[PDB]
PDB file of all heavy atoms in Angstrom:
ATOM      1  N   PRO U 603      13.018   3.116  17.237  1.00  0.00           N
ATOM      2  CA  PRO U 603      14.071   2.262  16.716  1.00  0.00           C
ATOM      3  C   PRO U 603      14.532   2.735  15.354  1.00  0.00           C
ATOM      4  O   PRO U 603      13.959   3.675  14.785  1.00  0.00           O
ATOM      5  CB  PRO U 603      13.403   0.888  16.623  1.00  0.00           C
ATOM      6  CG  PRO U 603      12.323   0.937  17.582  1.00  0.00           C
ATOM      7  CD  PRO U 603      11.812   2.329  17.536  1.00  0.00           C
ATOM      8  N   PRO U 604      15.557   2.102  14.786  1.00  0.00           N
ATOM      9  CA  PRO U 604      16.034   2.539  13.468  1.00  0.00           C
ATOM     10  C   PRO U 604      15.113   2.164  12.328  1.00  0.00           C
ATOM     11  O   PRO U 604      15.156   2.826  11.285  1.00  0.00           O
ATOM     12  CB  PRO U 604      17.383   1.824  13.331  1.00  0.00           C
ATOM     13  CG  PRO U 604      17.768   1.451  14.716  1.00  0.00           C
ATOM     14  CD  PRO U 604      16.490   1.152  15.407  1.00  0.00           C
ATOM     15  N   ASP U 605      14.275   1.144  12.500  1.00  0.00           N
ATOM     16  CA  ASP U 605      13.539   0.540  11.398  1.00  0.00           C
ATOM     17  C   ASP U 605      12.042   0.647  11.628  1.00  0.00           C
ATOM     18  O   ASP U 605      11.308  -0.327  11.447  1.00  0.00           O
ATOM     19  CB  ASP U 605      13.953  -0.920  11.219  1.00  0.00           C
ATOM     20  CG  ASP U 605      13.743  -1.742  12.466  1.00  0.00           C
ATOM     21  OD1 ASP U 605      13.332  -1.178  13.501  1.00  0.00           O
ATOM     22  OD2 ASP U 605      13.995  -2.962  12.413  1.00  0.00           O
ATOM     23  N   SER U 606      11.585   1.825  12.027  1.00  0.00           N
ATOM     24  CA  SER U 606      10.178   2.030  12.312  1.00  0.00           C
ATOM     25  C   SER U 606       9.818   3.471  12.003  1.00  0.00           C
ATOM     26  O   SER U 606      10.679   4.291  11.677  1.00  0.00           O
ATOM     27  CB  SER U 606       9.872   1.684  13.758  1.00  0.00           C
ATOM     28  OG  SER U 606      10.126   0.314  14.001  1.00  0.00           O
ATOM     29  N   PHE U 607       8.527   3.764  12.097  1.00  0.00           N
ATOM     30  CA  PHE U 607       7.991   5.096  11.882  1.00  0.00           C
ATOM     31  C   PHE U 607       7.422   5.646  13.183  1.00  0.00           C
ATOM     32  O   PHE U 607       7.432   4.996  14.227  1.00  0.00           O
ATOM     33  CB  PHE U 607       6.903   5.098  10.807  1.00  0.00           C
ATOM     34  CG  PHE U 607       7.394   4.789   9.441  1.00  0.00           C
ATOM     35  CD1 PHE U 607       6.928   3.700   8.747  1.00  0.00           C
ATOM     36  CD2 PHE U 607       8.250   5.645   8.815  1.00  0.00           C
ATOM     37  CE1 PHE U 607       7.360   3.452   7.470  1.00  0.00           C
ATOM     38  CE2 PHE U 607       8.688   5.392   7.560  1.00  0.00           C
ATOM     39  CZ  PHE U 607       8.243   4.298   6.883  1.00  0.00           C
ATOM     40  N   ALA U 608       6.910   6.864  13.092  1.00  0.00           N
ATOM     41  CA  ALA U 608       6.199   7.546  14.158  1.00  0.00           C
ATOM     42  C   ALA U 608       4.867   8.034  13.632  1.00  0.00           C
ATOM     43  O   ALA U 608       4.528   9.214  13.720  1.00  0.00           O
ATOM     44  CB  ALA U 608       7.021   8.689  14.714  1.00  0.00           C
ATOM     45  N   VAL U 609       4.115   7.086  13.065  1.00  0.00           N
ATOM     46  CA  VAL U 609       3.039   7.355  12.119  1.00  0.00           C
ATOM     47  C   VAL U 609       2.084   8.430  12.594  1.00  0.00           C
ATOM     48  O   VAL U 609       1.648   8.449  13.749  1.00  0.00           O
ATOM     49  CB  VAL U 609       2.272   6.054  11.834  1.00  0.00           C
ATOM     50  CG1 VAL U 609       1.013   6.334  11.061  1.00  0.00           C
ATOM     51  CG2 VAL U 609       3.138   5.116  11.068  1.00  0.00           C
ATOM     52  N   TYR U 610       1.744   9.320  11.673  1.00  0.00           N
ATOM     53  CA  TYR U 610       0.673  10.277  11.833  1.00  0.00           C
ATOM     54  C   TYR U 610      -0.319  10.108  10.699  1.00  0.00           C
ATOM     55  O   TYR U 610       0.009   9.600   9.625  1.00  0.00           O
ATOM     56  CB  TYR U 610       1.206  11.698  11.854  1.00  0.00           C
ATOM     57  CG  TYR U 610       1.967  12.001  13.097  1.00  0.00           C
ATOM     58  CD1 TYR U 610       3.335  11.906  13.123  1.00  0.00           C
ATOM     59  CD2 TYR U 610       1.315  12.358  14.255  1.00  0.00           C
ATOM     60  CE1 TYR U 610       4.036  12.165  14.257  1.00  0.00           C
ATOM     61  CE2 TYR U 610       2.006  12.631  15.396  1.00  0.00           C
ATOM     62  CZ  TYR U 610       3.367  12.528  15.400  1.00  0.00           C
ATOM     63  OH  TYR U 610       4.053  12.807  16.558  1.00  0.00           O
ATOM     64  N   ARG U 611      -1.539  10.543  10.961  1.00  0.00           N
ATOM     65  CA  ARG U 611      -2.650  10.403  10.042  1.00  0.00           C
ATOM     66  C   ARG U 611      -2.965  11.749   9.418  1.00  0.00           C
ATOM     67  O   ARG U 611      -2.571  12.798   9.924  1.00  0.00           O
ATOM     68  CB  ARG U 611      -3.869   9.855  10.774  1.00  0.00           C
ATOM     69  CG  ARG U 611      -5.005   9.440   9.893  1.00  0.00           C
ATOM     70  CD  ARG U 611      -6.095   8.781  10.689  1.00  0.00           C
ATOM     71  NE  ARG U 611      -5.685   7.471  11.178  1.00  0.00           N
ATOM     72  CZ  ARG U 611      -5.743   6.349  10.468  1.00  0.00           C
ATOM     73  NH1 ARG U 611      -6.189   6.337   9.229  1.00  0.00           N
ATOM     74  NH2 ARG U 611      -5.346   5.217  11.013  1.00  0.00           N
ATOM     75  N   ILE U 612      -3.659  11.699   8.292  1.00  0.00           N
ATOM     76  CA  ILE U 612      -4.081  12.887   7.570  1.00  0.00           C
ATOM     77  C   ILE U 612      -5.508  12.684   7.102  1.00  0.00           C
ATOM     78  O   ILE U 612      -5.854  11.614   6.600  1.00  0.00           O
ATOM     79  CB  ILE U 612      -3.168  13.165   6.368  1.00  0.00           C
ATOM     80  CG1 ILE U 612      -1.719  13.358   6.791  1.00  0.00           C
ATOM     81  CG2 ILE U 612      -3.641  14.362   5.650  1.00  0.00           C
ATOM     82  CD1 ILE U 612      -1.451  14.562   7.620  1.00  0.00           C
ATOM     83  N   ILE U 613      -6.333  13.719   7.251  1.00  0.00           N
ATOM     84  CA  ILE U 613      -7.715  13.676   6.804  1.00  0.00           C
ATOM     85  C   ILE U 613      -8.057  14.961   6.077  1.00  0.00           C
ATOM     86  O   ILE U 613      -8.369  15.976   6.706  1.00  0.00           O
ATOM     87  CB  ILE U 613      -8.687  13.471   7.975  1.00  0.00           C
ATOM     88  CG1 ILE U 613      -8.390  12.158   8.684  1.00  0.00           C
ATOM     89  CG2 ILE U 613     -10.133  13.545   7.485  1.00  0.00           C
ATOM     90  CD1 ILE U 613      -7.524  12.325   9.879  1.00  0.00           C
ATOM     91  N   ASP U 614      -8.032  14.919   4.755  1.00  0.00           N
ATOM     92  CA  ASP U 614      -8.598  16.005   3.979  1.00  0.00           C
ATOM     93  C   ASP U 614     -10.071  16.180   4.327  1.00  0.00           C
ATOM     94  O   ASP U 614     -10.728  15.280   4.854  1.00  0.00           O
ATOM     95  CB  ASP U 614      -8.413  15.749   2.486  1.00  0.00           C
ATOM     96  CG  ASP U 614      -9.023  14.440   2.031  1.00  0.00           C
ATOM     97  OD1 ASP U 614      -9.580  13.706   2.874  1.00  0.00           O
ATOM     98  OD2 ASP U 614      -8.933  14.138   0.822  1.00  0.00           O
ATOM     99  N   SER U 615     -10.593  17.355   4.016  1.00  0.00           N
ATOM    100  CA  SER U 615     -11.954  17.695   4.392  1.00  0.00           C
ATOM    101  C   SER U 615     -12.988  17.192   3.393  1.00  0.00           C
ATOM    102  O   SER U 615     -14.101  17.725   3.358  1.00  0.00           O
ATOM    103  CB  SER U 615     -12.086  19.205   4.581  1.00  0.00           C
ATOM    104  OG  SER U 615     -11.292  19.651   5.665  1.00  0.00           O
ATOM    105  N   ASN U 616     -12.650  16.187   2.587  1.00  0.00           N
ATOM    106  CA  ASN U 616     -13.631  15.398   1.861  1.00  0.00           C
ATOM    107  C   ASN U 616     -13.947  14.093   2.572  1.00  0.00           C
ATOM    108  O   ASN U 616     -14.745  13.302   2.062  1.00  0.00           O
ATOM    109  CB  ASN U 616     -13.128  15.076   0.458  1.00  0.00           C
ATOM    110  CG  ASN U 616     -14.238  14.688  -0.489  1.00  0.00           C
ATOM    111  OD1 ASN U 616     -15.404  14.606  -0.114  1.00  0.00           O
ATOM    112  ND2 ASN U 616     -13.878  14.466  -1.740  1.00  0.00           N
ATOM    113  N   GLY U 617     -13.338  13.844   3.725  1.00  0.00           N
ATOM    114  CA  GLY U 617     -13.516  12.615   4.450  1.00  0.00           C
ATOM    115  C   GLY U 617     -12.478  11.559   4.145  1.00  0.00           C
ATOM    116  O   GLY U 617     -12.354  10.594   4.907  1.00  0.00           O
ATOM    117  N   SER U 618     -11.730  11.717   3.058  1.00  0.00           N
ATOM    118  CA  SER U 618     -10.673  10.777   2.744  1.00  0.00           C
ATOM    119  C   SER U 618      -9.548  10.880   3.757  1.00  0.00           C
ATOM    120  O   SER U 618      -9.560  11.706   4.668  1.00  0.00           O
ATOM    121  CB  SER U 618     -10.127  11.019   1.352  1.00  0.00           C
ATOM    122  OG  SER U 618      -8.914  10.316   1.211  1.00  0.00           O
ATOM    123  N   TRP U 619      -8.547  10.028   3.583  1.00  0.00           N
ATOM    124  CA  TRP U 619      -7.428  10.037   4.503  1.00  0.00           C
ATOM    125  C   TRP U 619      -6.296   9.195   3.960  1.00  0.00           C
ATOM    126  O   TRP U 619      -6.493   8.299   3.137  1.00  0.00           O
ATOM    127  CB  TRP U 619      -7.822   9.516   5.877  1.00  0.00           C
ATOM    128  CG  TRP U 619      -8.325   8.137   5.896  1.00  0.00           C
ATOM    129  CD1 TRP U 619      -9.615   7.737   5.814  1.00  0.00           C
ATOM    130  CD2 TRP U 619      -7.543   6.957   6.024  1.00  0.00           C
ATOM    131  NE1 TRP U 619      -9.689   6.369   5.879  1.00  0.00           N
ATOM    132  CE2 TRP U 619      -8.424   5.868   6.007  1.00  0.00           C
ATOM    133  CE3 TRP U 619      -6.181   6.716   6.143  1.00  0.00           C
ATOM    134  CZ2 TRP U 619      -7.985   4.559   6.108  1.00  0.00           C
ATOM    135  CZ3 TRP U 619      -5.748   5.415   6.240  1.00  0.00           C
ATOM    136  CH2 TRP U 619      -6.643   4.355   6.227  1.00  0.00           C
ATOM    137  N   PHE U 620      -5.108   9.485   4.465  1.00  0.00           N
ATOM    138  CA  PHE U 620      -3.964   8.614   4.304  1.00  0.00           C
ATOM    139  C   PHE U 620      -3.050   8.824   5.490  1.00  0.00           C
ATOM    140  O   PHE U 620      -3.149   9.827   6.200  1.00  0.00           O
ATOM    141  CB  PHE U 620      -3.229   8.879   2.998  1.00  0.00           C
ATOM    142  CG  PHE U 620      -2.645  10.240   2.904  1.00  0.00           C
ATOM    143  CD1 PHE U 620      -1.344  10.474   3.278  1.00  0.00           C
ATOM    144  CD2 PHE U 620      -3.389  11.283   2.416  1.00  0.00           C
ATOM    145  CE1 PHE U 620      -0.803  11.730   3.186  1.00  0.00           C
ATOM    146  CE2 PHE U 620      -2.851  12.543   2.319  1.00  0.00           C
ATOM    147  CZ  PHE U 620      -1.557  12.765   2.704  1.00  0.00           C
ATOM    148  N   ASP U 621      -2.156   7.871   5.689  1.00  0.00           N
ATOM    149  CA  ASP U 621      -1.203   7.933   6.775  1.00  0.00           C
ATOM    150  C   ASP U 621       0.134   8.425   6.263  1.00  0.00           C
ATOM    151  O   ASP U 621       0.402   8.449   5.062  1.00  0.00           O
ATOM    152  CB  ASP U 621      -1.027   6.572   7.428  1.00  0.00           C
ATOM    153  CG  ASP U 621      -2.222   6.153   8.247  1.00  0.00           C
ATOM    154  OD1 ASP U 621      -2.948   7.034   8.749  1.00  0.00           O
ATOM    155  OD2 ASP U 621      -2.422   4.933   8.411  1.00  0.00           O
ATOM    156  N   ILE U 622       0.972   8.837   7.203  1.00  0.00           N
ATOM    157  CA  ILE U 622       2.335   9.260   6.928  1.00  0.00           C
ATOM    158  C   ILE U 622       3.227   8.665   7.997  1.00  0.00           C
ATOM    159  O   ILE U 622       2.850   8.625   9.171  1.00  0.00           O
ATOM    160  CB  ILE U 622       2.469  10.791   6.901  1.00  0.00           C
ATOM    161  CG1 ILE U 622       1.782  11.353   5.663  1.00  0.00           C
ATOM    162  CG2 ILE U 622       3.914  11.194   6.963  1.00  0.00           C
ATOM    163  CD1 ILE U 622       1.591  12.834   5.692  1.00  0.00           C
ATOM    164  N   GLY U 623       4.409   8.234   7.595  1.00  0.00           N
ATOM    165  CA  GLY U 623       5.416   7.755   8.508  1.00  0.00           C
ATOM    166  C   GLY U 623       6.578   8.712   8.550  1.00  0.00           C
ATOM    167  O   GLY U 623       6.773   9.522   7.648  1.00  0.00           O
ATOM    168  N   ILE U 624       7.339   8.622   9.635  1.00  0.00           N
ATOM    169  CA  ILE U 624       8.520   9.443   9.839  1.00  0.00           C
ATOM    170  C   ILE U 624       9.621   8.532  10.346  1.00  0.00           C
ATOM    171  O   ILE U 624       9.539   8.016  11.464  1.00  0.00           O
ATOM    172  CB  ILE U 624       8.275  10.588  10.822  1.00  0.00           C
ATOM    173  CG1 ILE U 624       7.321  11.597  10.201  1.00  0.00           C
ATOM    174  CG2 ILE U 624       9.585  11.228  11.191  1.00  0.00           C
ATOM    175  CD1 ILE U 624       6.778  12.587  11.144  1.00  0.00           C
ATOM    176  N   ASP U 625      10.656   8.350   9.540  1.00  0.00           N
ATOM    177  CA  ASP U 625      11.799   7.566   9.948  1.00  0.00           C
ATOM    178  C   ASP U 625      12.624   8.367  10.952  1.00  0.00           C
ATOM    179  O   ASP U 625      12.388   9.557  11.179  1.00  0.00           O
ATOM    180  CB  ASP U 625      12.615   7.182   8.718  1.00  0.00           C
ATOM    181  CG  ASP U 625      13.625   6.096   8.998  1.00  0.00           C
ATOM    182  OD1 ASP U 625      13.750   5.692  10.172  1.00  0.00           O
ATOM    183  OD2 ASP U 625      14.286   5.639   8.044  1.00  0.00           O
ATOM    184  N   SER U 626      13.589   7.693  11.582  1.00  0.00           N
ATOM    185  CA  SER U 626      14.500   8.373  12.494  1.00  0.00           C
ATOM    186  C   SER U 626      15.226   9.514  11.809  1.00  0.00           C
ATOM    187  O   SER U 626      15.527  10.529  12.443  1.00  0.00           O
ATOM    188  CB  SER U 626      15.524   7.391  13.040  1.00  0.00           C
ATOM    189  OG  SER U 626      16.371   6.944  12.005  1.00  0.00           O
ATOM    190  N   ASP U 627      15.515   9.361  10.524  1.00  0.00           N
ATOM    191  CA  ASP U 627      16.236  10.392   9.787  1.00  0.00           C
ATOM    192  C   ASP U 627      15.465  11.698   9.695  1.00  0.00           C
ATOM    193  O   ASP U 627      16.048  12.778   9.726  1.00  0.00           O
ATOM    194  CB  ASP U 627      16.548   9.906   8.376  1.00  0.00           C
ATOM    195  CG  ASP U 627      17.036   8.481   8.354  1.00  0.00           C
ATOM    196  OD1 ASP U 627      16.973   7.825   9.413  1.00  0.00           O
ATOM    197  OD2 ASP U 627      17.480   8.017   7.284  1.00  0.00           O
ATOM    198  N   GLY U 628      14.151  11.588   9.585  1.00  0.00           N
ATOM    199  CA  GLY U 628      13.281  12.737   9.433  1.00  0.00           C
ATOM    200  C   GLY U 628      12.546  12.770   8.119  1.00  0.00           C
ATOM    201  O   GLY U 628      11.562  13.509   7.992  1.00  0.00           O
ATOM    202  N   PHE U 629      12.999  12.008   7.132  1.00  0.00           N
ATOM    203  CA  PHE U 629      12.289  11.935   5.869  1.00  0.00           C
ATOM    204  C   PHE U 629      10.901  11.377   6.087  1.00  0.00           C
ATOM    205  O   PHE U 629      10.733  10.299   6.663  1.00  0.00           O
ATOM    206  CB  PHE U 629      13.043  11.068   4.873  1.00  0.00           C
ATOM    207  CG  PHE U 629      14.319  11.659   4.416  1.00  0.00           C
ATOM    208  CD1 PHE U 629      15.511  11.242   4.949  1.00  0.00           C
ATOM    209  CD2 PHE U 629      14.327  12.647   3.463  1.00  0.00           C
ATOM    210  CE1 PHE U 629      16.699  11.781   4.516  1.00  0.00           C
ATOM    211  CE2 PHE U 629      15.508  13.201   3.040  1.00  0.00           C
ATOM    212  CZ  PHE U 629      16.694  12.771   3.570  1.00  0.00           C
ATOM    213  N   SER U 630       9.909  12.118   5.631  1.00  0.00           N
ATOM    214  CA  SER U 630       8.561  11.610   5.643  1.00  0.00           C
ATOM    215  C   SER U 630       8.445  10.451   4.667  1.00  0.00           C
ATOM    216  O   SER U 630       9.258  10.286   3.757  1.00  0.00           O
ATOM    217  CB  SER U 630       7.586  12.715   5.280  1.00  0.00           C
ATOM    218  OG  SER U 630       7.626  13.747   6.247  1.00  0.00           O
ATOM    219  N   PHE U 631       7.426   9.632   4.876  1.00  0.00           N
ATOM    220  CA  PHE U 631       7.160   8.513   3.995  1.00  0.00           C
ATOM    221  C   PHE U 631       5.664   8.288   3.934  1.00  0.00           C
ATOM    222  O   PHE U 631       4.918   8.683   4.833  1.00  0.00           O
ATOM    223  CB  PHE U 631       7.869   7.247   4.459  1.00  0.00           C
ATOM    224  CG  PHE U 631       9.349   7.279   4.287  1.00  0.00           C
ATOM    225  CD1 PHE U 631      10.165   7.549   5.353  1.00  0.00           C
ATOM    226  CD2 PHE U 631       9.925   7.023   3.066  1.00  0.00           C
ATOM    227  CE1 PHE U 631      11.522   7.559   5.219  1.00  0.00           C
ATOM    228  CE2 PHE U 631      11.283   7.040   2.923  1.00  0.00           C
ATOM    229  CZ  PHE U 631      12.085   7.307   3.999  1.00  0.00           C
ATOM    230  N   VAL U 632       5.235   7.630   2.865  1.00  0.00           N
ATOM    231  CA  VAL U 632       3.828   7.414   2.575  1.00  0.00           C
ATOM    232  C   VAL U 632       3.711   6.053   1.906  1.00  0.00           C
ATOM    233  O   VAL U 632       4.703   5.476   1.462  1.00  0.00           O
ATOM    234  CB  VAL U 632       3.265   8.529   1.673  1.00  0.00           C
ATOM    235  CG1 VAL U 632       3.775   8.374   0.277  1.00  0.00           C
ATOM    236  CG2 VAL U 632       1.768   8.564   1.696  1.00  0.00           C
ATOM    237  N   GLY U 633       2.481   5.553   1.808  1.00  0.00           N
ATOM    238  CA  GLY U 633       2.213   4.223   1.302  1.00  0.00           C
ATOM    239  C   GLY U 633       1.413   4.157   0.021  1.00  0.00           C
ATOM    240  O   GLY U 633       1.360   3.104  -0.619  1.00  0.00           O
ATOM    241  N   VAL U 634       0.775   5.256  -0.363  1.00  0.00           N
ATOM    242  CA  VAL U 634      -0.031   5.267  -1.576  1.00  0.00           C
ATOM    243  C   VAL U 634       0.852   5.488  -2.788  1.00  0.00           C
ATOM    244  O   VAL U 634       2.035   5.815  -2.666  1.00  0.00           O
ATOM    245  CB  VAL U 634      -1.134   6.335  -1.541  1.00  0.00           C
ATOM    246  CG1 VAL U 634      -2.005   6.140  -0.361  1.00  0.00           C
ATOM    247  CG2 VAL U 634      -0.558   7.704  -1.559  1.00  0.00           C
ATOM    248  N   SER U 635       0.261   5.316  -3.965  1.00  0.00           N
ATOM    249  CA  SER U 635       0.917   5.594  -5.229  1.00  0.00           C
ATOM    250  C   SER U 635       0.614   6.988  -5.745  1.00  0.00           C
ATOM    251  O   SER U 635       1.421   7.543  -6.498  1.00  0.00           O
ATOM    252  CB  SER U 635       0.477   4.571  -6.276  1.00  0.00           C
ATOM    253  OG  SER U 635       1.083   4.823  -7.529  1.00  0.00           O
ATOM    254  N   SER U 636      -0.524   7.560  -5.363  1.00  0.00           N
ATOM    255  CA  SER U 636      -0.925   8.869  -5.845  1.00  0.00           C
ATOM    256  C   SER U 636      -1.716   9.582  -4.766  1.00  0.00           C
ATOM    257  O   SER U 636      -2.156   8.980  -3.785  1.00  0.00           O
ATOM    258  CB  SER U 636      -1.775   8.771  -7.106  1.00  0.00           C
ATOM    259  OG  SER U 636      -3.017   8.161  -6.814  1.00  0.00           O
ATOM    260  N   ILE U 637      -1.884  10.882  -4.967  1.00  0.00           N
ATOM    261  CA  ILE U 637      -2.670  11.720  -4.076  1.00  0.00           C
ATOM    262  C   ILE U 637      -3.711  12.468  -4.887  1.00  0.00           C
ATOM    263  O   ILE U 637      -4.919  12.305  -4.686  1.00  0.00           O
ATOM    264  CB  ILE U 637      -1.776  12.713  -3.324  1.00  0.00           C
ATOM    265  CG1 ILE U 637      -0.706  12.000  -2.504  1.00  0.00           C
ATOM    266  CG2 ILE U 637      -2.620  13.588  -2.474  1.00  0.00           C
ATOM    267  CD1 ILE U 637      -1.203  11.162  -1.388  1.00  0.00           C
ATOM    268  N   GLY U 638      -3.233  13.309  -5.795  1.00  0.00           N
ATOM    269  CA  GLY U 638      -4.113  14.121  -6.601  1.00  0.00           C
ATOM    270  C   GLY U 638      -4.544  15.365  -5.847  1.00  0.00           C
ATOM    271  O   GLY U 638      -3.846  15.867  -4.965  1.00  0.00           O
TER     272      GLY U 638
END
């Protein structure tokens, strides 16, 4: 739909993780404030 993501996950090899969204446009999106 126009107002949703196609969420994928990410797991660095320290065991941490964050998710990523993809709008219909193609711009990636994220939910955290920082990564480091």
Side-chain angles (χ1 to χ4, degrees):
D605 58 357
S606 297
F607 293 119
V609 170
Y610 290 97
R611 190 174 290 277
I612 301 294
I613 300 96
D614 57 359
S615 295
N616 200 357
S618 166
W619 60 267
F620 63 93
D621 288 333
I622 289 167
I624 292 167
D625 194 356
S626 67
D627 317 9
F629 292 101
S630 297
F631 289 100
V632 73
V634 303
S635 179
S636 67
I637 301 295

